[PDB]
A = this chain, B = another copy of it.
Amino acid sequence: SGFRKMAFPSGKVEGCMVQVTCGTTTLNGLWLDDTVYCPRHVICTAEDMLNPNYEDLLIRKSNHSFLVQAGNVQLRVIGHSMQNCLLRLKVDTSNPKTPKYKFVRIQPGQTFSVLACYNGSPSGVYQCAMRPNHTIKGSFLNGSCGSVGFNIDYDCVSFCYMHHMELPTGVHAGTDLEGKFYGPFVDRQTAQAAGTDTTITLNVLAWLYAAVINGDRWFLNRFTTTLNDFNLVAMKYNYEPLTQDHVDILGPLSAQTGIAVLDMCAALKELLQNGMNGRTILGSTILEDEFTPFDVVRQCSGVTFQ
């Protein structure tokens, strides 16, 4: 029993975290085989941050300008190249702790674990969701550039996020491991801001199913809804429209609990329209939207508490 925001065990990633230094700039890098990945912002001159030309900045560097520290060992850089907003640094030694890994581009609404890191030293691990506006609600201080987000399945690490910057609202933006930003952000100082965000409807529905699996049904009702009738209410409360694809994804949870998806949609519609009435669901008074249907099946029992 119970339901917690749960991260993947971080050991396989901790063994890949290194420190990368260019002159007076230090941040974190990811050491896989004989390559070290890090934000290209490491090469950025202090008193120019508005208009950096990274191609012109990087042509001026040699291999030995990069200091890469793995623990108390220095790694020798024997090659470098730019890939979108990251640098790939080839080093003289293959990381002996490299796990089986893959690079993946996560989709909005999906969740992943973040290993917050400073000066190449992991500091904490937490779970978060890629918001529809392509930011994450992380917890990061100065020095966290290059911290990594990931998921794990069967001893394989799927890296999906490298951290770059904090936006003015206090949320966070970064790239995949090919160096392509999530969302419309760029790695320079501009007036860029997070766009308007939405609530992840599919995840709220999954979390209501988790609540039933664990034994709570107080929020159900005797009604059903059409998909389009639900989406009219979703629009008014800044929820994402529900699609048939999302209904299909909820199939297994629907089967496990015996609650048809559109019946749960009617329950959510009443919750949006009437509020919580001073009640909680899995310990929360807010409708939680950072658990995916996958996360619920992973964490919840396969047997409903009927």
With A2-B138, A2-B172, A5-B5 as contacts: A285 and B286 at CB distance below 8 Å: yes
In the complex, whether A139 has a CB less than 8 A from a CB of chain B is yes
- Contact residue range for chain A? 35 or more
For A101, list chain B residues within 8 Å (CB): none
For A192, list chain B residues within 8 Å (CB): none
Determine which of B7, B11, B140 lies in contact with A2 in the assembled complex, contact meaning CB atoms within 8 Å. Answer: B140
With A7-B7, A10-B9, A14-B11 as contacts: A124 and B2 at CB distance below 8 Å: no
Contact between B126 and A9 (Cβ–Cβ < 8 Å)? no
Contact between A9 and B170 (Cβ–Cβ < 8 Å)? no
For A7, list chain B residues within 8 Å (CB): 7, 124-126
With A14-B11, A170-B214 as contacts: A5 and B283 at CB distance below 8 Å: no
Chain B minimum-CB-distance residue to A136:
B2
For A126, list chain B residues within 8 Å (CB): 4-7
With A2-B139, A139-B4 as contacts: A10 and B170 at CB distance below 8 Å: no
In the complex, whether A271 has a CB less than 8 A from a CB of chain B is no
For A141, list chain B residues within 8 Å (CB): 301
- Whole-angstrom CA separation of A1 from B284 in the bound complex: 23
Contact between A1 and B170 (Cβ–Cβ < 8 Å)? yes
For A1, list chain B residues within 8 Å (CB): 139-140, 166, 170
- Whole-angstrom CA separation of A236 from B9 in the bound complex: 41
- Whole-angstrom CA separation of A152 from B283 in the bound complex: 27
In the complex, whether A122 has a CB less than 8 A from a CB of chain B is yes
Chain B minimum-CB-distance residue to A14:
B11
Chain B minimum-CB-distance residue to A114:
B4
Contact between A3 and B299 (Cβ–Cβ < 8 Å)? no
For A185, list chain B residues within 8 Å (CB): none
Q: Which of A94-145 contact B (CB under 8 A)?
A: 115-116, 122-126, 128, 137-141
A153 to B: closest C-beta gap in Å: 12
For A171, list chain B residues within 8 Å (CB): 2
- Whole-angstrom CA separation of A9 from B116 in the bound complex: 9
- Whole-angstrom CA separation of A8 from B10 in the bound complex: 9
In the complex, whether A15 has a CB less than 8 A from a CB of chain B is yes
Contact between B6 and A116 (Cβ–Cβ < 8 Å)? yes
5 further contact pairs, Cβ within 8 A, besides A1-B166, A9-B10, A9-B115: A2-B140, A2-B170, A4-B137, A5-B126, A11-B12
